[PDB]
Amino acid sequence: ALIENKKAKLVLIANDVDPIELVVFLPALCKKMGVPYAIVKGKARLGTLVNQKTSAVA
Amino acid sequence: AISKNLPILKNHFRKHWQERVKVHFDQAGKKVSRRNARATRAAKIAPRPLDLLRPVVRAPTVKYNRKVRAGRGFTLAEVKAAGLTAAYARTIGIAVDHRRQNRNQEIFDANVQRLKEYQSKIIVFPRNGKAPEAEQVLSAAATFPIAQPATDVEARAVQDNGESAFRTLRLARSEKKFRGIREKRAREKAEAE
Amino acid sequence: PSRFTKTRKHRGHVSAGKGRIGKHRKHPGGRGMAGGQHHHRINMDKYHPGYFGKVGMRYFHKQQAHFWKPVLNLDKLWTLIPEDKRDQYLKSASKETAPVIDTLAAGYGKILGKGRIPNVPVIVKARFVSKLAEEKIRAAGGVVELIA
Amino acid sequence: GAYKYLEELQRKKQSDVLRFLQRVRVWEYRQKNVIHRAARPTRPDKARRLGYKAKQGFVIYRVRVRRGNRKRPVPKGATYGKPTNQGVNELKYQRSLRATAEERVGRRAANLRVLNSYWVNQDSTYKYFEVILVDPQHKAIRRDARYNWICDPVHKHREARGLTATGKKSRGINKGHKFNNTKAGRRKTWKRQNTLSLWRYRK
Amino acid sequence: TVKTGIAIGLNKGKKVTSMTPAPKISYKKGAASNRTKFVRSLVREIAGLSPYERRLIDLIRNSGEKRARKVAKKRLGSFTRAKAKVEEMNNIIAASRRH
Amino acid sequence: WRKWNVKVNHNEKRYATASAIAATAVASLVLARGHRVEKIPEIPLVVSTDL
RNA sequence: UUGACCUCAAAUCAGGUAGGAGUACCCGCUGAACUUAAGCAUAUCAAUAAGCGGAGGAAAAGAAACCAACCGGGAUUGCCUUAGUAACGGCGAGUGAAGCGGCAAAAGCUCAAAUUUGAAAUCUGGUACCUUCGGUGCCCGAGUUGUAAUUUGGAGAGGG
RNA sequence: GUUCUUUGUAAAGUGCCUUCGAAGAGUCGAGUUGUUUGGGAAUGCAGCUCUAAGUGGGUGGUAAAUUCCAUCUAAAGCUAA
Structure with a gap:
């Protein structure tokens, strides 16, 4: 929703989603709207940034 | 097998029909049980009359379009027309039909005045008030009978025009029948340049 | 009741009214409708001509309400008018007062000209009418008003 | 908003992107038991559409079932009757393949109550389904009147009796004319239509 | 819907003062929308076209339009889906040809 | 399934009830039934409503 | 090196639950043949008996991806009726519904798909106390691959 | 019917204007086979193969092409008598 409303300026994406379909569009939304994204290694490291176990996005 | 001068008969008794045989020997027994549960409720x-105010509704299927009959619910246009909300009307013994739609004003206003007459003749009691006893009656359908609308006046003039009203029926069917070919012939005739 | 049937009178008599040579048996000629185009032909032909074959065309999903058109004959046309409310109309062939007979309210879809109405003018409201029916009402002085 | 992209791609099964996903996924399923726990719904837009919630007490199980006809279990094709009952091979099993896939989990996880199920993958041999379970014994479902109905004892083994979406379809339970012979149940119609009624004052 | 007042004919029936009641919202359930059009757009972009979908562009380019539907008539279930599925592909051709 | 109850025309039940009502005022018939009405003043026997 | 995530295990780990019996009446699944056709093979018995799975006090069905073609009706169930009819059928033997009308009973509805993003607000479980079909304090966990709040097409949501 | 707590700086209903209004997929649907039906150029069901859509789709009991019209909202769910 943030990407659709142009309310994002940097997206962090985990590459380790076991179902990949949750994210295959995320690099695709970010370009067509114009948001820059970073596919970064690790949910467990995007997790502690959120104080969770996995986030798959940030 | 076949024999003296008798009609043919189709008697369907070649299954084990002897176990699926009902003889309601309970006809009188069920009647009394109905009349207890009718009163126990x-x-x-x-105070309430055991039933919902049902509307007056003109039947389908041209065989029976000629009479009017109780319906299932009050066609949200009706409950909003008489100035009341459906969620509350369902608490006042009004049956409301969320899926029926009004299409005839004479039928439409009949339900409105039916519902207006209902509002005058009912007494709603406060959730915290004294709630005085009000000598219930056991039927809204009895208190507000479904009366067939009056169609014509018993005396009128004679207006003869010579059309004989039979040629009208003969002409009509020829119009429903032959319309197609002369309307298709209309196109191909207009196709000339 | 059992005490009146001839079974009470067939006690003591061996065959019980079934014969000694015939020897009443289970189903000597086949059960049901066997032998129609076979040993029972003469019976079927003499009493049931038309029992085999087909005659016309089929019709799927019939409901008998499209052909619903109960008939009222022109002989009566008056049992619909109330009994005590009749005789003052038959004696007074008055114009601009003639009765309206709504056959549908009676339950009749068609009117046919069975015969000999009184010559008083009357207004009839009919879905359908017969040809000879319509002028016989009109020759009396009335008119038929098509209704739907 | 994520499910809306999940919904639409998951219907693009014959695109080069899912044909890779489809082909890879079927291999690991075939590499595991015929019926087993799935770690999570591989189709979250599908599971949650089918009543699933990511709450303690919803259970995931993947199933695979054998495909094709039902060969009649007669020794050497011996039917012992009339010619019309001589077929042995072209027999098609009126109950569906997911309907027979739910029953084995219900037998397996008997203390659970099946909610619904859906297709995940397939191959020539095995048709694949995920089955959504729910536990009436868990307090996170006993409360929350959204999901307290499944706790009622009339809802044991809903699939074996055929009360799921699989069975209600196989049983032909839908409104209108194309479902006359089975509208409230084919047997109940037959018994009602093949009963003769007699009153005290016989008509 | 103007009844003629007679049980037969073109507009058979008794004339009654109609009302034209309020629109039923469950008629545009299958009508497209803003969220619908956008997501449907991007899915086609990130998924591509099907093996049978590609054979649709291949045949429409080479040997004409009539048989494009005929192969679409069998490959799709109904014929009404075949005409639509062809026009979905002509839009792809127009989009690619512009670029 | 035997036929226990027998349906009787409504008009006949009304016919027969009127006959058995008209037969209550015949002392010849009432004596034939053995009702010991030899000492009754007259029939029909009507008493005041206070009964 | 250490700490996580995913996935998969183990335990006489804490708490549970399925089984078996009965099974007239219900929901499925499998499925005959005797018989009728004056033989008999499609047909009929019969979508039945036998066999298997699964419940309740009733079950099941149930609030239209319905019925109709009317001046439209309005969940489902059951009765009377439609009707031994439309239709099927070695068009033979035979089979065989439903809409319409009156009555019993009548009751409606809710989820998915929407950022709370100015704040995981949610839920299990553990422990102490208390007024225990439970409430409160505290603590891990589930939970961002979505648990609470908000709305269900008959609508409704964001603003004035 | 009697009484104690005020739940709540909360919730519901209601008129006019504006912008939207997401509504379910190995599913619908089609062919073929089998079985099933009263369902007829195919009533349901199931097997295989194919497998969509958004003024769309399902139905409208004679197959097909073209033009209209009516009525509902499936692939999700609860519910007494």
């Missing part, structure tokens, strides 16, 4: 809901 009437005590539990004491």
Whole structure:
């Protein structure tokens, strides 16, 4: 929703989603709207940034 | 097998029909049980008449379009027309039909005045008030009978025009029948340049 | 009741009214409708001509309400008018007062000209009418009003 | 908003992107038991559409079932009757393949109550389904009147009796004319239509 | 819907003062929308076209339009889906040809 | 399934009830039934409503 | 090196639950043949008996991806009726519904798909106390691959 | 019917204007086979193969092409008598 409303300026994406379909569009939304994204290694490291176990996005 | 001068008969008894045989020997027994549960509910809901105000509705299927009959619910246009909300009307013994739609004003206003007459003749009691006893009656359908609308006046003039009203029926069917070819012939005739 | 049937009178008599040579048996000629185009032909032909074959065309999903058109004959046309409310109309062939007979309210879809109405003018409201029916009403002085 | 992209791609099964996903996924399923726990719904837009919630007490199980006809279990094709009952091979099993896939989990996880199920993958041999379970014994479902109905004892083994979406379809339970012979149940119609009624004052 | 007042004919029936009641919202359930059009757009972009979908562009380019539907008539279930599925592909051709 | 109850025309039940009502005022018939009405003043026997 | 995530295990780990019996009446699944056709093979018995799975006090069905073609009706169930009819059928033997009308009973509805993003607000479980079909304090966990709040097409949501 | 707590700086209903209004997929649907039906150029069901859509789709009991019209909202769910 943030990407659709142009309310994002940097997206962090985990590459380790076991179902990949949750994210295959995320690099695709970010370009067509114009948001820059970073596919970064690790949910467990995007997790502690959120104080969770996995986030798959940030 | 076949024999003296008798009609043919189709008697369907070649299955084990002897176990699926009902003889309601309970006809009188069920009747009394109905009349207890009819009153036992009437005590539990004491003031209310055991039924919802049902509307007046013109039947389908041209065989029966000629009479009018109780319907299922009050066609949200009706409950909003008489100035009341459906969620509350369902608490006032009004049956409301969320899926029926009004299409005839004479039928339409009949339900409005039916519902207006209902509002005058009912007494709604406060959730915290004294709630005085009000001598229930056991039927809204009895208190507001479904009366067939009056169609014509018993005396009128004679207006003869010579059309004989039979040629009208003969002409009509020829119009429903032959319309297609002369309307298709209309196109191909207009196709000339 | 059992005490009146001839079974009470067939006690003591061996065959019980079934014969000694015939010897009443289970189903000597086949059960049901066997032998129609076979040993029972003469019976079927003499009493049931038309029992085999087909005659016309089929019709799927029939409901008998499209052909619903109960008939009222022109002989009566008056049992619909109330009994005590009749005789003052038959004696007074008055114009601009003639009765309206709504056959549908009676339950009749068609009117046919069975015969000999009184010559008083009357207004009839009919879905359908017969040809000879319509002028016989009109020759009396009335008119038929098509209704739907 | 994520499910809306999940919904639409998951219907693009014959695109080069899912044909890779489809082909890879079927291999690991075939590499595991015929019926087993799935770690999570591989189709979250599908599971949650089918009543699933990511709450303690919803259970995931993947199933695979054998495909094709039902060969009649007669020794050497011996039917012992009339010619019309001589077929042995072209027999098609009126109950569906997911309907027979739910029953084995219900037998397996008997203390659970099946909610619904859906297709995940397939191959020539095995048709694949995920089955959504729910536990009436868990307090996170006993409360929350959204999901307290499944706790009622009339809802044991809903699939074996055929009360799921699989069975209600196989049983032909839908409104209108194309479902006359089975509208409230084919047997109940037959018994009602093949009963003769007699009153005290016989008509 | 103007009844003629007679049980037969073109507009058979008794004339009654109609009302034209309020629109039923469950008629545009299958009508497209803003969220619908956008997501449907991007899915086609990130998924591509099907093996049978590609054979649709291949045949429409080479040997004409009539048989494009005929192969679409069998490959799709109904014929009404075949005409639509062809026009979905002509839009792809127009989009690619512009670029 | 035997036929226990027998349906009787409504008009006949009304016919027969009127006959058995008209037969209550015949002392010849009432004596034939053995009702010991030899000492009754007259029939029909009507008493005041206070009964 | 250490700490996580995913996935998969183990335990006489804490708490549970399925089984078996009965099974007239219900929901499925499998499925005959005797018989009728004056033989008999499609047909009929019969979508039945036998066999298997699964419940309740009733079950099941149930609030239209319905019925109709009317001046439209309005969940489902059951009765009477439609009707031994439309239709099927070695068009033979035979089979065989439903809409319409009156009555019993009548009751409606809710989820998915929407950022709370100015704040995981949610839920299990553990422990102490208390007024225990439970409430409160505290603590891990589930939970961002979505648990609470908000709305269900008959609508409704964001603003004035 | 009697009484104690005020739940709540909360919730519901209601008129006019504006912008939207997401509504379910190995599913619908089609062919073929089998079985099933009263369902007829195919009533349901199931097997295989194919497998969509958004003024769309399902139905409208004679197959097909073209033009209209009516009525509902499936692939999700609860519910007494």
